[PDB]
Design a protein around this nucleic acid. Sequence first.
DNA 1: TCTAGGGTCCTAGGACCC
DNA 2: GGGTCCTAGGACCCT
Length: 342
Amino acid sequence: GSRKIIHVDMDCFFAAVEMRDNPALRDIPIAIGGSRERRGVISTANYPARKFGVRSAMPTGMALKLCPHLTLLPGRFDAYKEASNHIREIFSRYTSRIEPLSLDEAYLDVTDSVHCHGSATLIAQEIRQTIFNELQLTASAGVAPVKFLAKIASDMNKPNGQFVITPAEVPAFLQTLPLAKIPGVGKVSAAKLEAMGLRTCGDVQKCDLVMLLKRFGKFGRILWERSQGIDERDVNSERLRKSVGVERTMAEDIHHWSECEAIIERLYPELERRLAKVKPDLLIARQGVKLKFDDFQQTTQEHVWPRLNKADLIATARKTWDERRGGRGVRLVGLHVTLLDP
DNA sequence: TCTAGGGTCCTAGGACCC
DNA sequence: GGGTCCTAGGACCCT
Ligand SMILES: [Mg+2]
Ligand SMILES: [Mg+2]
């Protein structure tokens, strides 16, 4: 009953699309990200820029210190959504068992496939090709018996490559696998685990489940499972969107309510336009606001509300402003909607 | 160098329900 | 005391 799971992951997705559409960008360092003047960060970069140390989520001022000739791009999201829709349709030629995890990646369960003699390796290869055909972008892939190993595997032969982990290969692979490689083990978790002497899945294998449960709750059960290759999560294919948000970081912190209210006036029409694409009648479960202060503490206040409404968002932002600001500057204002359950 | 914007999921206290 | 809803915060994911 061993399953075949593929994780397909586009290479330097946003940047790859910009280079296809502007070949002048191919061999110089480029990045999609907000300018230093907009206090932006890097969304992604191409390999010429990564050579200098440019990475996703890095402050753009830092990316420019590392790479002074970096070419900053604003982003063409409809072009990325178009490429996303296209690779998802390519996935559909092979199976309906597709769980997209973001624009540029997905899990596929090809256990019950008989497309390439049932070879998940050859299916992944055929998918990466033809994606390169048809779209002129490259993808990488991982093949494993469970989700998280497949997702780790797709990173190991990036770019334009793939990696296959068989059941017989799982124990040696786990033994020295850093815990931070596990999707969902982030910086904070890895430091907590490091400070108790737990760096790798092999370290966690020597641990008692009861101890992991005491110290990490349900997450400790995830750690215990993942450190043994155990990951029973099914490829879904029926996941639905649950929220939509629109937020903006200003170039300068704002200090007056009038400024905050003016930001909301520009944010609201965008939130409405995006909700209306998915819920034309604007009916929702909750709506609310977000403020982030100059000390980077952030607060949200949100409440049951039946239908997108600008004045209530302004009013709610006003309360948040007056009540939780305590004289600090505000760097970000955000609007938010929680979608109805079905 | 100085910190985005799009999201999902988990936790947790009091309210409310029984 | 036990479910479940409401709400806020935070870790983490993607580019
Ligand atoms: Mg990618
Ligand atoms: Mg990806």
